[model samples]
Target: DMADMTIKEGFAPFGDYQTWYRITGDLRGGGTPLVILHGGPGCTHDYVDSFKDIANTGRAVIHYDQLGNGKSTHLPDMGSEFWTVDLFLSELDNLLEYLEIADDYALLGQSWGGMLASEHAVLQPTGLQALIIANSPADMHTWVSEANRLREELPDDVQATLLKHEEAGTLTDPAYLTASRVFYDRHVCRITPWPVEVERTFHQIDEDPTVYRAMNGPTEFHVIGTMKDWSIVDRLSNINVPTLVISGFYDEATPLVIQPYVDNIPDVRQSVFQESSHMPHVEERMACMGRVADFLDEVATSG
Candidate 1:
């Protein structure tokens, strides 16, 4: 249904599977479409659905579920060995080539999505003119360490509860969730009653933990999976495109986590939203959206 703007949703083949994607607004009417990547090895685009507003800026916005996750092909039995970064990179590339947008595109990656985008940027693709890495870390070491540091700052009982459950390996305990909220409240999304979109993503992950459990472990800070030792800090300088960074001061992707991007990526700028935690795009919704839209319009047009 095309009312004010057009929306196209489809799939792009990735090896034996397919990646589900949706593009809102007119691709030809914009300077360059922005491809959005959601966080989580398993998070669906539902949480980042607010990005669809970017379409109103006269630029198309693309949202997709990576191959092994939501809305796309799901492989419940695939192990960590099969969820490598290369697989995701291939899917992103395949999407671009399939949609014929490889020649003109910008990327907006949030959290894990940002990490993936950085990998793509480091490769120096001619078509990737601009990058927006929001609430992401350039080094997983800083990420895990910073996450623990934040955990320590939580109320003593909360921290103790978290450690107790983690040590017991009983993440399913209801108490663990209560303790987890202490971190999520201050760091993930400050919103008291999280929006429906955010809840939807969480629900989906609860239903299928395959990719996330294999790649990122059970919780945000409790990373013990394939990406535990990941670090792109040394290669960050390889990204030569115009880049804009965004992170909340209270973000789990703390100053230390997001710092390397500023220190390494050339032609980069950033925004530190004081009131937000991890998901600023949600906490500071309107302003963050405007900032992103304006930034893309400014750089993408002249890029």
Candidate 2:
């Protein structure tokens, strides 16, 4: 019954590659279609699947895997230069056109996906209606700074282990991976037993990290990739569409990380999920969905 109510899987061509996508609900409803942009310059759409609940509200929800990960094209051979922000942006535009919803859609981007959405929104496309930026940093500098601060808060031994492996470039060591899992469990997912779909996405990245390596580095806290210096705070004021900012109290994006949009955007509001960390959709599913549904309702009917 749950499966029948939502989830339709498919693919679309972005240039020469076929991008994987899933949709829930009909877009013909009066409310704006909601396109979900997942994180990890490489993470799959699997984790964000919880948002499918919005389908019950008569608002179509779209989820897609970007070019080099998930069910889409996986070009592990393509090096760092191939995974630029513009490349993903182009892929996003292509997905929009392919879906034929480019003219009537809102966007909900989580983590790196939020960064991508922020960049896309500033382009000022006439088709853009609203935006939801969840648990993303305004700038990589601030992100890295906060990451390091958090790392220091870890147990001294954990911090030492991380630093040793990081310096030795042995991040793949079992001990390091185990330590990283602790951080991920505490902040990234927060769900004691992560959802199956979320685990699947993690496996996808572990299988082929070319895109992640190029854009986001090896681990969540590391900042060795090309996007290490990237920041969009200067452009926050340029977003003209209605926007909703979502984050958790313990999120890496933290209140400080997400404050720029709330303070600078022309039309914006925010919802802080009390018991959540980074993956609020999964960590606080019901409340997150209810707040999002309410936000969408308000935005859909407002002037």
Candidate 3:
């Protein structure tokens, strides 16, 4: 079955940079096109690779490393201003045009990608057939607040360790990283032993943190990035397309972080995976994929 899958990998021009993409499955049949956006302003597309499974359903799925991460052009030379929300939005638009999907396609954005997709949907692009926002926030302020609350709830020793390093601006201290992993293990991906794909992305970022440092700062809880105060709650109502919001019971994008979409999106559905943390694709793989496949099929056939 894996042999039947076809993945075309290449680059497309995005302004002066080249955006890398891997398209799997068939697209010639005119089925729905699904584009996935990975998390981290700096994260690679490796973690979202599971989405390729949907291609078996006859729908093509596209996964691309954003302008600065993974196989995409690394712009360590660019300043923080260059990595703004609008810049990524422009890059996504460019990819859509390059793939000729600007006129028709669905989007699945995870974490920061979801935030970006929310921004994209607000534009009411005529081609946006369906939207999926997974493990994201409507407002960075809320995210920061929630992160702080969670941080406070960590064991007293862990909280003290995090605070000491954060206050000292020593985020890279080995102790801090080790302690952070403790929290991450419980909330980020919970899949003990961690999936190889997810670890690969982490290693990739560790190798060259140009995009991560530029956009998301040193850690997930800390918001020293340019988009720290970003908020898209008010724009939710503007997204008229059918939407699906997903999160795990233990996801960092807690109920509060994801509530706005459920409360505001016009025609939206929500699913929470009880066994998963931030990554249901690994913790609840089959169930997560099935939910998405069913949702896409329903929407595609109905509309």
Candidate 4:
């Protein structure tokens, strides 16, 4: 019993680097472990800690900071060319193999993390038994369009404030920060005061935004990076496993944003948390985790 309860945290060797990870529960228990992927392309694995609740379902759960963010390697000097999708994909692969969990694992990726997992799933990796794509868009164009659509609903003054600061290159202006909050409040996380874990991930991004800037631009809606035009719709068919899609009612990843995966993945199912925003895991922790646990159980039993 103690063996299954052990929690291990360590670094896994990567391409001339290392990826930091934490594991709760033991893989030796028989069922496949759950691998969590955080968002931001630069966000840490802090907020998604709610997924750790799954370990209570008698399965291991792995959380790792992607390179250039959180406690992982920070490559501030690395150019845009060094922050390709391949980099994180390789890191995920490396981590799984290092922990010897690649033979049996399920993944839950949020936002940009979901994008990365979508790419990984397309490879049809033999070990990936199930997938959960939460609050992620299938294409950059849809994401931007949906973001702008949501932004248009903001107060006129807020819109002007954003436009003014953006055009003047004055993101530091108090008005711009306030305007950004309006958008964030409306979609990102509806919870009045964001959970500390969410703030921690944002703080981590502020600490080092190498990957964020290179792949996701300077701000959430102002995407102008290599991933700006990325699309995985055509390849959704390649994901040959049971998939669960989750999103919040007011999620930045609106219905249209995440529809492609629902429409394309062969065995996909979806759940939209009505009382939450972008982060259903934190906003509706109990319900979200229950749904996830149920899905994973179904996969384990039927697979």
In candidate 3, stretches whose alpha carbon ends up further than 4 angstroms from where it belongs are: 1-4, 301-303
Question: What TM value does model 4 have?
Answer: 0.96
The alpha-carbon root-mean-square deviation between model 3 and the true structure, to one decimal in Å, is 1.7
The sequence of per-residue lDDT tens digits that candidate 3 reaches over residues 73-192 is 987888787788888899999999999988878999999989999999999999888999999999988888888888877888888888899899998898888788777887788987
List the pairs of residues colliding in candidate 2.
none
Model 2 per-residue lDDT tens digits across residues 1-303: 342256678888887798999888766543788899999989999989899888787777888999999999989889988899999999889988888888878899999999999999988888898899999988998888888888888888888888899999997898888888777777788887888989999999999988988898888889799999998998989898999999998888878778888988899989998889899998899999898888888776321
List ranges where model 1 is wrong by over 4 Å.
1-4
Model 2: what TM-score? 0.96
Quote the RMSD, in angstroms, for model 4: 1.6
lDDT of each: 0.89, 0.87, 0.87, 0.89
Least well predicted 10-residue stretch by lDDT in candidate 1: 1-10
The segments of candidate 4 whose C-alpha lies over 4 angstroms from its true place after superposition are 1-4, 172-174, 301-303
Candidate 1 lDDT by residue in tens digits, 25-54:
778756689999998877899989989888
Query: What's the distance in Å from true for residue 122, model 2?
Result: 0.9
Regions of candidate 2 where Cα sits further than 4 Å from its true position: 1-7, 301-303
Q: Would you list the clashing residue pairs of candidate 4?
A: none
